[PDB]
PDB file of N, CA, C and O and ligand atoms in Angstrom:
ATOM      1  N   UNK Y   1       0.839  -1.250   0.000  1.00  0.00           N
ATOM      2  CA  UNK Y   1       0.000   0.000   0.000  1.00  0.00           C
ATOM      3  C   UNK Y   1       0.843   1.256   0.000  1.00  0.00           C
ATOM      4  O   UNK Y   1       2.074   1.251   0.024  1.00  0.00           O
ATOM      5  N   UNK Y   2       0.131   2.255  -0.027  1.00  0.00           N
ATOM      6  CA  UNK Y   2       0.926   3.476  -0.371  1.00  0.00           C
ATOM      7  C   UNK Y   2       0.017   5.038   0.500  1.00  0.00           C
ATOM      8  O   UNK Y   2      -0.821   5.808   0.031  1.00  0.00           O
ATOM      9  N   UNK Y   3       0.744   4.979   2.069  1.00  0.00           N
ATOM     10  CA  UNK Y   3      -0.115   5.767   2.909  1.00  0.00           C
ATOM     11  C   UNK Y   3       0.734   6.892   2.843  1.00  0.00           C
ATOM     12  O   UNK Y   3       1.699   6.645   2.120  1.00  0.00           O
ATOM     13  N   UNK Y   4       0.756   8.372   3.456  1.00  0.00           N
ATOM     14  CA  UNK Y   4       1.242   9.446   3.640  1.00  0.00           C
ATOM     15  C   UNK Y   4       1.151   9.609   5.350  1.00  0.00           C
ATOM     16  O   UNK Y   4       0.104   9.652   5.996  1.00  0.00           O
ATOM     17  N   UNK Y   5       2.471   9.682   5.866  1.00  0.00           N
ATOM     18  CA  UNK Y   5       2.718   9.901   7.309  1.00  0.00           C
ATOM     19  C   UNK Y   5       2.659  11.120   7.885  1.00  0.00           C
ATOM     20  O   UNK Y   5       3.326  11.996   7.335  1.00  0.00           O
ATOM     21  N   UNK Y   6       2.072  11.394   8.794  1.00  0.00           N
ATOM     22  CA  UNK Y   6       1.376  12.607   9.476  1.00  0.00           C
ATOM     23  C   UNK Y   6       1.893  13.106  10.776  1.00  0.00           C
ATOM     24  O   UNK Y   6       1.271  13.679  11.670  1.00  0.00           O
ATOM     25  N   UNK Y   7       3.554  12.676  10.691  1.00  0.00           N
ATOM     26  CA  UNK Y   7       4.226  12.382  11.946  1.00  0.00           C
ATOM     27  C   UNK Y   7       4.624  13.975  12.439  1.00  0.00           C
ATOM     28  O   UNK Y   7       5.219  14.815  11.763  1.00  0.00           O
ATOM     29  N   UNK Y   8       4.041  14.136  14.007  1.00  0.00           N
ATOM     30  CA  UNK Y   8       3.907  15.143  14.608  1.00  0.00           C
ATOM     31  C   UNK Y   8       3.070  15.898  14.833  1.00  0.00           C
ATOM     32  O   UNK Y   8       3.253  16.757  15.695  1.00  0.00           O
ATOM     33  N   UNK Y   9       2.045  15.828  14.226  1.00  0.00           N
ATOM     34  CA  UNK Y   9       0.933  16.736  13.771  1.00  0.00           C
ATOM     35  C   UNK Y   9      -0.370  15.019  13.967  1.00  0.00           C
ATOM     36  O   UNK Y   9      -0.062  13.842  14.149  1.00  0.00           O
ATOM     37  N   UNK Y  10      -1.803  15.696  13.812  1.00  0.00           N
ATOM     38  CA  UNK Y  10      -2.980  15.050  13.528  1.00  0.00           C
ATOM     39  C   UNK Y  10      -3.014  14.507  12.210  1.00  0.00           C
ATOM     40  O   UNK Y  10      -2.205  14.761  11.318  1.00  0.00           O
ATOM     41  N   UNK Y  11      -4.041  13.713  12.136  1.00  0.00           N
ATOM     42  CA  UNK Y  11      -4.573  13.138  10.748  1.00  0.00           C
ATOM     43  C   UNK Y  11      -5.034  14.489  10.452  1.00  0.00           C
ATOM     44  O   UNK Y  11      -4.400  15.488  10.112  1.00  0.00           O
ATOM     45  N   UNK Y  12      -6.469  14.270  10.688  1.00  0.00           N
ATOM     46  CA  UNK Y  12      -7.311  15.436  10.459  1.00  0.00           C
ATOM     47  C   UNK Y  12      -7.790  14.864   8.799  1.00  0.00           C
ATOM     48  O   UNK Y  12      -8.134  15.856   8.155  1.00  0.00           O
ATOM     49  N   UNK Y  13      -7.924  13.362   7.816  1.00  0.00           N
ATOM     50  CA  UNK Y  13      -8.139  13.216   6.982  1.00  0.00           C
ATOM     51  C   UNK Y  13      -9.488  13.850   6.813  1.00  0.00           C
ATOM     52  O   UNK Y  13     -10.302  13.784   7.734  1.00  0.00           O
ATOM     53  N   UNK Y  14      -9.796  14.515   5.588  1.00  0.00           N
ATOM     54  CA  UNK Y  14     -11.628  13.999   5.888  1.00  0.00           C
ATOM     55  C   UNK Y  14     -12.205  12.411   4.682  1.00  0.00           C
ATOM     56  O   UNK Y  14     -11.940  11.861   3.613  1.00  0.00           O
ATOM     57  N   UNK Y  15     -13.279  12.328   6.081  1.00  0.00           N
ATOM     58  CA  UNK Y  15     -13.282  11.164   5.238  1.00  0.00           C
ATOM     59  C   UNK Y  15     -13.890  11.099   3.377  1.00  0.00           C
ATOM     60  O   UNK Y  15     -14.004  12.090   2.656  1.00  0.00           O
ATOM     61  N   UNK Y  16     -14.122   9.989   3.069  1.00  0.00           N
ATOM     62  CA  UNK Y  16     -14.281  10.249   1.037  1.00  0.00           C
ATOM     63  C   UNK Y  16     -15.588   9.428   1.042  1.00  0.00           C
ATOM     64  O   UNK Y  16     -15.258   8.407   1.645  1.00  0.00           O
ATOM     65  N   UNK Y  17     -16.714   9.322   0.750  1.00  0.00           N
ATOM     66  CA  UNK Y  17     -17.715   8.673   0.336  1.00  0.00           C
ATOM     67  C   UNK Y  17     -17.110   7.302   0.229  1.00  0.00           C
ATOM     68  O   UNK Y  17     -16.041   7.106  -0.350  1.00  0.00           O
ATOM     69  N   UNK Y  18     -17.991   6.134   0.938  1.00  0.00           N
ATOM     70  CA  UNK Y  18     -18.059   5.204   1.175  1.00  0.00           C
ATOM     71  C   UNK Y  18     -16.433   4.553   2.194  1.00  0.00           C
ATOM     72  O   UNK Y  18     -16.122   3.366   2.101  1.00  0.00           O
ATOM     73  N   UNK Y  19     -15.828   5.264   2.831  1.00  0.00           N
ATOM     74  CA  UNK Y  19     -15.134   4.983   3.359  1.00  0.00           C
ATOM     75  C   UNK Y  19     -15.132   4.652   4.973  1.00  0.00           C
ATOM     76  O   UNK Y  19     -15.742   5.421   5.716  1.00  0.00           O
ATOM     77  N   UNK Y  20     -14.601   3.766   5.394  1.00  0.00           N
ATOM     78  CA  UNK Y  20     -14.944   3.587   6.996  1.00  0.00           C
ATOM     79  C   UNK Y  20     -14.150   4.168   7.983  1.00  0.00           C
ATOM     80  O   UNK Y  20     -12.933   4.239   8.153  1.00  0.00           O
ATOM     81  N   UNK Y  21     -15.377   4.672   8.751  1.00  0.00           N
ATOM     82  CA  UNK Y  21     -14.733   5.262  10.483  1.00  0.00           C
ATOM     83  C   UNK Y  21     -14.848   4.327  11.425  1.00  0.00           C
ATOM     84  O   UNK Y  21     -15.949   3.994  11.861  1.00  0.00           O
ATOM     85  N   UNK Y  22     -13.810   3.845  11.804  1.00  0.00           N
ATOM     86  CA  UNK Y  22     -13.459   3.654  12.729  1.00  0.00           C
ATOM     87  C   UNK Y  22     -13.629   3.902  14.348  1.00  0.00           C
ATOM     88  O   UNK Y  22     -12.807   4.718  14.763  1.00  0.00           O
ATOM     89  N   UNK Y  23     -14.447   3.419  15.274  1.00  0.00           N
ATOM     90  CA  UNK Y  23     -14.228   3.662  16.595  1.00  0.00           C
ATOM     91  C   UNK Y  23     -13.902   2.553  17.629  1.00  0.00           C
ATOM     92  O   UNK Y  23     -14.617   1.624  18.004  1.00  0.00           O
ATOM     93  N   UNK Y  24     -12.960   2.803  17.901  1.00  0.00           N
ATOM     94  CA  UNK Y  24     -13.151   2.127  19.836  1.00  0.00           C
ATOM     95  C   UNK Y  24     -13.516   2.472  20.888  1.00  0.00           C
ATOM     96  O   UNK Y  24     -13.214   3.577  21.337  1.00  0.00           O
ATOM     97  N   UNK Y  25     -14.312   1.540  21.584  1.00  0.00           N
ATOM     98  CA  UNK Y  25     -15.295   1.808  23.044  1.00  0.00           C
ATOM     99  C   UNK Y  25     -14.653   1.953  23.839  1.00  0.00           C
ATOM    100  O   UNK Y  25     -15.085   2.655  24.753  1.00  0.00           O
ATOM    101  N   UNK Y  26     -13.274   1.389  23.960  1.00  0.00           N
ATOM    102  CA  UNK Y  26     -11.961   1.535  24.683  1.00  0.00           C
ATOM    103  C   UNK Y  26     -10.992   2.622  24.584  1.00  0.00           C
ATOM    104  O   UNK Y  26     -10.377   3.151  25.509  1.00  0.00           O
ATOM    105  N   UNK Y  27     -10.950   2.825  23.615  1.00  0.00           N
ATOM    106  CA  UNK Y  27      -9.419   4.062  23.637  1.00  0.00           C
ATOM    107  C   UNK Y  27     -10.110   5.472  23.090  1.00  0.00           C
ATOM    108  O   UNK Y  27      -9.342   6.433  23.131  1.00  0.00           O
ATOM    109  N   UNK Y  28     -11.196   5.690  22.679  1.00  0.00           N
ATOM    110  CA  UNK Y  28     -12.200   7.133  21.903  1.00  0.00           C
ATOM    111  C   UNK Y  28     -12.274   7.642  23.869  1.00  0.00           C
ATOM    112  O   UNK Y  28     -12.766   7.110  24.863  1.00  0.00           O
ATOM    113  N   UNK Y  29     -11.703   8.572  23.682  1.00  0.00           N
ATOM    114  CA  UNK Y  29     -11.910   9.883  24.594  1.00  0.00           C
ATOM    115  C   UNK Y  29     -13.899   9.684  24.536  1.00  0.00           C
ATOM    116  O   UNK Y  29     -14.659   9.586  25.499  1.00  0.00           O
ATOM    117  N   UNK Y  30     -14.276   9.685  22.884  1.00  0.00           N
ATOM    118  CA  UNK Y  30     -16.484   9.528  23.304  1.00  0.00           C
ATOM    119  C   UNK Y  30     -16.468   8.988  21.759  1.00  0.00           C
ATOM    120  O   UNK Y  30     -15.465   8.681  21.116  1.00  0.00           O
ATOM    121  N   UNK Y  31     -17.940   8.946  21.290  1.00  0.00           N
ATOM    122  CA  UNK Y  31     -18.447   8.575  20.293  1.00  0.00           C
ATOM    123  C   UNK Y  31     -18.208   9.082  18.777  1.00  0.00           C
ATOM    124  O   UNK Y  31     -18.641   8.579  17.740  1.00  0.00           O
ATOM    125  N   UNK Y  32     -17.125  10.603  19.002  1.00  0.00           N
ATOM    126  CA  UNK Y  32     -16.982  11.291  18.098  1.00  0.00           C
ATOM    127  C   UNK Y  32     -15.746  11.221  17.877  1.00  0.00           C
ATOM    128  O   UNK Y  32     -15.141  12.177  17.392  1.00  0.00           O
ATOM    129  N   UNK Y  33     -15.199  10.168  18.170  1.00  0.00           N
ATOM    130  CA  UNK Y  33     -13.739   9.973  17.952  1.00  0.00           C
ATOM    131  C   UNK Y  33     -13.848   9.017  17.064  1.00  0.00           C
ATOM    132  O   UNK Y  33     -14.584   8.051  17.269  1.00  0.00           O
ATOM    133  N   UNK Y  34     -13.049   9.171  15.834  1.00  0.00           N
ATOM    134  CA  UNK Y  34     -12.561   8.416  14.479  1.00  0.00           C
ATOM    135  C   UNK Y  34     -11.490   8.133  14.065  1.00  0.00           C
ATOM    136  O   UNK Y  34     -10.674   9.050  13.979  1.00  0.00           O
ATOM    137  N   UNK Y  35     -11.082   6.739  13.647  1.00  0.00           N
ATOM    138  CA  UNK Y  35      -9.707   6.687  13.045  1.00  0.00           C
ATOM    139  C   UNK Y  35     -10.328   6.328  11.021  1.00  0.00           C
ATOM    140  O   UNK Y  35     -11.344   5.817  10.551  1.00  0.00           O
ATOM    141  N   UNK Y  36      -9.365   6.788  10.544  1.00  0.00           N
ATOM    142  CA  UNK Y  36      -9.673   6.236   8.762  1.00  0.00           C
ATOM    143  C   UNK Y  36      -8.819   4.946   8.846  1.00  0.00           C
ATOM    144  O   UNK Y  36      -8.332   4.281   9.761  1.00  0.00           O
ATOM    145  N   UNK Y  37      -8.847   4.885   7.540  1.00  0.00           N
ATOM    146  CA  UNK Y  37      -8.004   3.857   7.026  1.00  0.00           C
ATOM    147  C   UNK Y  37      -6.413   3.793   6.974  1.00  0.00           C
ATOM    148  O   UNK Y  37      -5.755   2.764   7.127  1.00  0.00           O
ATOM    149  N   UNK Y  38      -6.083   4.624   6.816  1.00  0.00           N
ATOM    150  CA  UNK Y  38      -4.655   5.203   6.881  1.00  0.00           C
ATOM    151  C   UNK Y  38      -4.056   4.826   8.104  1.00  0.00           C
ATOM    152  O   UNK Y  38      -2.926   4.351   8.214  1.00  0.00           O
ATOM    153  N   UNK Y  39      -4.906   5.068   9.076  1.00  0.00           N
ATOM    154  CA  UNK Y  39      -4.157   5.497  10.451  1.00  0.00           C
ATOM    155  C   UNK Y  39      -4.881   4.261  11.580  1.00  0.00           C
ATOM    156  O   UNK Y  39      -4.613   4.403  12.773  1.00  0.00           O
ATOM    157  N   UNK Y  40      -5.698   3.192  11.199  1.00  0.00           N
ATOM    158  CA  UNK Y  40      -6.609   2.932  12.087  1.00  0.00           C
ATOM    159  C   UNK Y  40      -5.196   1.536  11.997  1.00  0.00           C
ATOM    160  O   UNK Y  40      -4.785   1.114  10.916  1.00  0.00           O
ATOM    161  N   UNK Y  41      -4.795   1.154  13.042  1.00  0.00           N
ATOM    162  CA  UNK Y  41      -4.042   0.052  13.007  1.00  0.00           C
ATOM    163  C   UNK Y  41      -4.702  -1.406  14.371  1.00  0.00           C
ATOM    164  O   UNK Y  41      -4.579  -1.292  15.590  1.00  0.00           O
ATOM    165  N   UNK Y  42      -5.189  -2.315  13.826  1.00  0.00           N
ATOM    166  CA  UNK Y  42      -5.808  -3.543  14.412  1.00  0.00           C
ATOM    167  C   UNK Y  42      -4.823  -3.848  15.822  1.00  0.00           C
ATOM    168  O   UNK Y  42      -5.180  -3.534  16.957  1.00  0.00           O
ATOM    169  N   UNK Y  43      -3.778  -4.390  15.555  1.00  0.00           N
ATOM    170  CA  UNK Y  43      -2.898  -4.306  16.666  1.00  0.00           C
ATOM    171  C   UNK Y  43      -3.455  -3.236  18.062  1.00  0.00           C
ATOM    172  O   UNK Y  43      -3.564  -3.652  19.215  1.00  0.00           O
ATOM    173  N   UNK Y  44      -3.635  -2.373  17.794  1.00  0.00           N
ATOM    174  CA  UNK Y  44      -3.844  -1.342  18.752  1.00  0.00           C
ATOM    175  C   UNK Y  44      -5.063  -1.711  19.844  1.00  0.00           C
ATOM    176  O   UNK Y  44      -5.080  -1.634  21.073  1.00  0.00           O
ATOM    177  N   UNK Y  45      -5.934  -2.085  19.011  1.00  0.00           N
ATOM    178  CA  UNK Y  45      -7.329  -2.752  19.260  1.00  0.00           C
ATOM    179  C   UNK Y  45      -7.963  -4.117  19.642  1.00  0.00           C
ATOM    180  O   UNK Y  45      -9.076  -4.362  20.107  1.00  0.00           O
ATOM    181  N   UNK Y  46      -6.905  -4.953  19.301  1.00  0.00           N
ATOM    182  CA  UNK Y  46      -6.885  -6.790  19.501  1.00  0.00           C
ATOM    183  C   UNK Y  46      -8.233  -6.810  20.858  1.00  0.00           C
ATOM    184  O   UNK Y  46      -9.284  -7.426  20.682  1.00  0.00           O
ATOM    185  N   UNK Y  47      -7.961  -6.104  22.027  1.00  0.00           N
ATOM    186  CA  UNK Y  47      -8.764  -6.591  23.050  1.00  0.00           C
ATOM    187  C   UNK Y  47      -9.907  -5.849  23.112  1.00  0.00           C
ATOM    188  O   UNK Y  47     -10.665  -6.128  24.041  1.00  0.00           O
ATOM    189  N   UNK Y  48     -10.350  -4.646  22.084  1.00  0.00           N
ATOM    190  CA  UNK Y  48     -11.096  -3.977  22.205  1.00  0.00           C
ATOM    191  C   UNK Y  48     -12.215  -4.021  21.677  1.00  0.00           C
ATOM    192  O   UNK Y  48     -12.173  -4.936  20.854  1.00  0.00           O
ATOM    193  N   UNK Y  49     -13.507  -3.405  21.682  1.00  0.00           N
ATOM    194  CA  UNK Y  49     -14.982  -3.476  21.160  1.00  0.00           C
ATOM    195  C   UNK Y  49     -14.571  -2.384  20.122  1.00  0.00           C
ATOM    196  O   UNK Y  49     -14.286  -1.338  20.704  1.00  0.00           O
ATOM    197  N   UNK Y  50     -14.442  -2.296  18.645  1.00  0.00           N
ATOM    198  CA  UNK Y  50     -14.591  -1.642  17.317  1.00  0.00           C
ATOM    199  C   UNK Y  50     -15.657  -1.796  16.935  1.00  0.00           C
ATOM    200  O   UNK Y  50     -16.209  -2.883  17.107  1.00  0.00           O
ATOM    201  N   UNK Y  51     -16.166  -0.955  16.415  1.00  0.00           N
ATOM    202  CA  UNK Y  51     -16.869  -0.724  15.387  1.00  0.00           C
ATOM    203  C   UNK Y  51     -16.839   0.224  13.676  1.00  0.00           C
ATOM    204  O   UNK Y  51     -16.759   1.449  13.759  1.00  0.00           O
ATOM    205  N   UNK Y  52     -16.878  -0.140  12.861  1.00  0.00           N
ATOM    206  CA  UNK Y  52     -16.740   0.646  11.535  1.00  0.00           C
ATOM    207  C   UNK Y  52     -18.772   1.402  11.186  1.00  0.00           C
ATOM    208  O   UNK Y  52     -19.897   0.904  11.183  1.00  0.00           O
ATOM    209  N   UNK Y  53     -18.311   2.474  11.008  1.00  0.00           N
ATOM    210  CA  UNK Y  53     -19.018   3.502   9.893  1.00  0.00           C
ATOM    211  C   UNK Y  53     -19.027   3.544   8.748  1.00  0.00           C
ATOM    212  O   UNK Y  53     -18.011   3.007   8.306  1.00  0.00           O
ATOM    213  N   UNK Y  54     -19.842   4.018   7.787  1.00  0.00           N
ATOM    214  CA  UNK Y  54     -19.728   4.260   6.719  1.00  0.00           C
ATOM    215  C   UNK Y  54     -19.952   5.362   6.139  1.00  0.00           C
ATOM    216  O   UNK Y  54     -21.137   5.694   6.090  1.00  0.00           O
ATOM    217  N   UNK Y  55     -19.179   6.061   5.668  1.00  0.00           N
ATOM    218  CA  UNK Y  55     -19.405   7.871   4.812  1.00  0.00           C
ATOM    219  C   UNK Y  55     -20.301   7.791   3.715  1.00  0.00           C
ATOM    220  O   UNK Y  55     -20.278   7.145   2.667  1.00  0.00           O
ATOM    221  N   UNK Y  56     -21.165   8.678   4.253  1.00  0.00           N
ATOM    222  CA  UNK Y  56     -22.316   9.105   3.280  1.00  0.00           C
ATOM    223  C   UNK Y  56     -22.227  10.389   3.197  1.00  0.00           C
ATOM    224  O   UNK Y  56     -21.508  10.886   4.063  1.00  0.00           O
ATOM    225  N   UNK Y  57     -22.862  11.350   2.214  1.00  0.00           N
ATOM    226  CA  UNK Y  57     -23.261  12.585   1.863  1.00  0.00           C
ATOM    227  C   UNK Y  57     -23.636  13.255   3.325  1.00  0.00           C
ATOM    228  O   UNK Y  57     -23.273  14.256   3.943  1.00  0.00           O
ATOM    229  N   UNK Y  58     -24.321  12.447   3.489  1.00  0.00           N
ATOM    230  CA  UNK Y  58     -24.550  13.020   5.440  1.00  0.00           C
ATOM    231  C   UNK Y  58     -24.116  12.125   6.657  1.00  0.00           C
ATOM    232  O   UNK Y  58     -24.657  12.409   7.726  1.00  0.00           O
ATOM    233  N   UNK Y  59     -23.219  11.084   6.651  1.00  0.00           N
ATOM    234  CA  UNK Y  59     -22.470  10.695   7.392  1.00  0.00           C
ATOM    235  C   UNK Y  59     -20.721  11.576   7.413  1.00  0.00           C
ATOM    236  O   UNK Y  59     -19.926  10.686   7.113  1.00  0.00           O
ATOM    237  N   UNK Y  60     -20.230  12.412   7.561  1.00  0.00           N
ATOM    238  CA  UNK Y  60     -19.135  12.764   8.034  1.00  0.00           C
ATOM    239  C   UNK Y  60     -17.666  12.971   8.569  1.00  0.00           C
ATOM    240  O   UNK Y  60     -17.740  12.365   9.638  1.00  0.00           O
ATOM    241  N   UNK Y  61     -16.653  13.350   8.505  1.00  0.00           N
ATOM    242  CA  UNK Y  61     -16.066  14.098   9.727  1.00  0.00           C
ATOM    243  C   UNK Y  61     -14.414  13.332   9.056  1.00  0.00           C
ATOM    244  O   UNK Y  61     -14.205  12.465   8.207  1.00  0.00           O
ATOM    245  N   UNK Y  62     -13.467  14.189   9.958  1.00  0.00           N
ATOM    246  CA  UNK Y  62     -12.105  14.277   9.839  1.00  0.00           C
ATOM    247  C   UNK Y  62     -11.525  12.585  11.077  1.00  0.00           C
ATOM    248  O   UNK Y  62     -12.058  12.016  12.030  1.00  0.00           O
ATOM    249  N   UNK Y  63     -10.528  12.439  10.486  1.00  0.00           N
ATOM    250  CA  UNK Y  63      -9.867  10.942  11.720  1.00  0.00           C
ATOM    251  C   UNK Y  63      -8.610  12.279  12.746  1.00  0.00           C
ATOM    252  O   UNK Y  63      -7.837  13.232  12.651  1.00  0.00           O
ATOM    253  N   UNK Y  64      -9.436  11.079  13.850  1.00  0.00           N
ATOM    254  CA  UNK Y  64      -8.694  12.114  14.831  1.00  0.00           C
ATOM    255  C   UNK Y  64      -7.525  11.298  15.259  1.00  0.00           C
ATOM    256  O   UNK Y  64      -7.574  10.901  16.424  1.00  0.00           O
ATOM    257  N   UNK Y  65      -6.491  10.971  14.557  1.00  0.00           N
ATOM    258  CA  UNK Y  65      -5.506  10.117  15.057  1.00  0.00           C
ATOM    259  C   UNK Y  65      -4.502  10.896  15.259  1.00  0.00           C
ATOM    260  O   UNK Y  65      -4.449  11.738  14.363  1.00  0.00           O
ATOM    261  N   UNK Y  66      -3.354  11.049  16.321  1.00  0.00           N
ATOM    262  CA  UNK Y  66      -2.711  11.848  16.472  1.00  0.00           C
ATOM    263  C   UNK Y  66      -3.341  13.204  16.890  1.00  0.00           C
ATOM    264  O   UNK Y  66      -2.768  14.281  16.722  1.00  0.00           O
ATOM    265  N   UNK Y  67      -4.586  13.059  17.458  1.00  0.00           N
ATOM    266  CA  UNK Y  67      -4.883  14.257  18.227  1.00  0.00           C
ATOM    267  C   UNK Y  67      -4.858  13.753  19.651  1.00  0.00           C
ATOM    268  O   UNK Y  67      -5.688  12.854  19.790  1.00  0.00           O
ATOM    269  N   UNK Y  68      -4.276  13.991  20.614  1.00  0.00           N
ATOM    270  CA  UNK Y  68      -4.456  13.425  21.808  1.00  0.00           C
ATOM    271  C   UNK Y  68      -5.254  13.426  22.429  1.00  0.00           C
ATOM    272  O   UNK Y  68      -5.446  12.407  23.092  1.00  0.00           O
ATOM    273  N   UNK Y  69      -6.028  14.389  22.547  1.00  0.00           N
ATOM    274  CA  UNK Y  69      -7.344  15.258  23.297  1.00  0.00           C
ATOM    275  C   UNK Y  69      -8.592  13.695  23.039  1.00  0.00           C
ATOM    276  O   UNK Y  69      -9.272  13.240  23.960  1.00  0.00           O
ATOM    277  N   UNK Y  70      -8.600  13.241  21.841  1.00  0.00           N
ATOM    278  CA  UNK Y  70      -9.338  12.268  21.265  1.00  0.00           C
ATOM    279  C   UNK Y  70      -8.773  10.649  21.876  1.00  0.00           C
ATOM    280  O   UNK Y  70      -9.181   9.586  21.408  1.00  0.00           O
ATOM    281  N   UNK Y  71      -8.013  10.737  22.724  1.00  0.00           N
ATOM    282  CA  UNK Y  71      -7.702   9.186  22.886  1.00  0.00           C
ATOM    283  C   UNK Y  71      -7.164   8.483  24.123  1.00  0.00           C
ATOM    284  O   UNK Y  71      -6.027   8.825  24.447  1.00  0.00           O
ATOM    285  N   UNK Y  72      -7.797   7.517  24.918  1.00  0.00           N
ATOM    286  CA  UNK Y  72      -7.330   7.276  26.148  1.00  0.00           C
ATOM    287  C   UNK Y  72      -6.099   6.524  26.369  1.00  0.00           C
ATOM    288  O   UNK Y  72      -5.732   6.255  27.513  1.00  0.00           O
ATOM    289  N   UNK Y  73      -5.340   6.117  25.174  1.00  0.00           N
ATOM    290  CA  UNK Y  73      -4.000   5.390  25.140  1.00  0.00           C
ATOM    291  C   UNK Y  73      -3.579   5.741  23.913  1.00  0.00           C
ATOM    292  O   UNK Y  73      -4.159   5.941  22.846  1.00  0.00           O
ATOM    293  N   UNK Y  74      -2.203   5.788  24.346  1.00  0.00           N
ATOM    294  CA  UNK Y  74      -1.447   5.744  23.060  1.00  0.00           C
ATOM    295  C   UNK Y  74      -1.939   4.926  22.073  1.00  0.00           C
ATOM    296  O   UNK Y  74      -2.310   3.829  22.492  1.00  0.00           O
ATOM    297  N   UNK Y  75      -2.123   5.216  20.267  1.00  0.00           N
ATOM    298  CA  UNK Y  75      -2.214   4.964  19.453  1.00  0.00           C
ATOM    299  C   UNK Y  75      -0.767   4.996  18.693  1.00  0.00           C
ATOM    300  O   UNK Y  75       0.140   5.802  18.904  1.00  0.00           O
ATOM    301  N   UNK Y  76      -0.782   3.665  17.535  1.00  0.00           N
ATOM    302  CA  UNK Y  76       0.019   3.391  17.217  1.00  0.00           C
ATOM    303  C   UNK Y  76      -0.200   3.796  15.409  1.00  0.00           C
ATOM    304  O   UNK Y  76      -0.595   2.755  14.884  1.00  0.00           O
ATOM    305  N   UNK Y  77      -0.131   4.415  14.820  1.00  0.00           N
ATOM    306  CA  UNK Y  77      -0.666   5.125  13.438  1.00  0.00           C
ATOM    307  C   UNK Y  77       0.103   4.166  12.552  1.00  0.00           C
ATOM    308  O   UNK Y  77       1.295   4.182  12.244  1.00  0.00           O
ATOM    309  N   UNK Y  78      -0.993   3.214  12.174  1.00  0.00           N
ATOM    310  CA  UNK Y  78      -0.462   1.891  10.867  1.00  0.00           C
ATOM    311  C   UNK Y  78       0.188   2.705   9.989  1.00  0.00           C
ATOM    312  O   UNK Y  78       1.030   2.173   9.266  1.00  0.00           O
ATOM    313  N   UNK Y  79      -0.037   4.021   9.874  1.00  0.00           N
ATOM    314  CA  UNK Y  79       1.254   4.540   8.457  1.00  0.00           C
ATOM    315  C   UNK Y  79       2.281   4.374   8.726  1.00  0.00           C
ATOM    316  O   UNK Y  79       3.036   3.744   7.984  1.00  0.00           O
ATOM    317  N   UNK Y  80       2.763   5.018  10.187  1.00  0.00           N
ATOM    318  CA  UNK Y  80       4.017   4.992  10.528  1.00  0.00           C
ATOM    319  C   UNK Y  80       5.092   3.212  10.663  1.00  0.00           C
ATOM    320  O   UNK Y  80       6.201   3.025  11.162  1.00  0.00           O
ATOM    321  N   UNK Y  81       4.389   2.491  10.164  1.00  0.00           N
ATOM    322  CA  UNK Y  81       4.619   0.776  10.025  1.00  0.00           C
ATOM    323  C   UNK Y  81       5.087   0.889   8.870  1.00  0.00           C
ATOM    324  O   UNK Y  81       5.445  -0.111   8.249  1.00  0.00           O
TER     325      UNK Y  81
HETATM  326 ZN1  LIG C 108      -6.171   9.151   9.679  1.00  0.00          ZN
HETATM  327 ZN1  LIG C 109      -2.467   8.266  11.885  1.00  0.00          ZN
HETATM  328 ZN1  LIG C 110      -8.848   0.435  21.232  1.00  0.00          ZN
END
């Protein structure tokens, strides 16, 4: 694959029609916390409750990976792999 690293700074992707958001019940600061595809790495999550979204015209919003404010443990950003 072929991702772009966001090292130091946030994702902040927005998401693209039909693409999945990402949440954990475990590490999301709340419900409005998102990882994309880029940045959402499984490892991180093994013991956790995920769930995926799907972007619609009125489904939404930017991945908050690398925002700290958004996350109760360190995240590990699959780009940086
Ligand atoms: Zn991202
Ligand atoms: Zn990331
Ligand atoms: Zn998690």
């Amino acid at each position: 694959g072929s991702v772009h690293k966001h090292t130091g700074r946030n994702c902040g992707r927005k998401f693209k029609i039909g693409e999945p958001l990402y949440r954990c019940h475990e590490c999301g600061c709340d419900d409005t916390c998102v990882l994309c595809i880029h940045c959402f790495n499984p490892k991180d999550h093994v013991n956790h409750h995920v769930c995926t979204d799907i972007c619609t015209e009125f489904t939404s919003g930017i991945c908050d990976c690398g925002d700290e404010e958004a996350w109760n443990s360190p995240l590990h950003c699959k780009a940086e792999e």
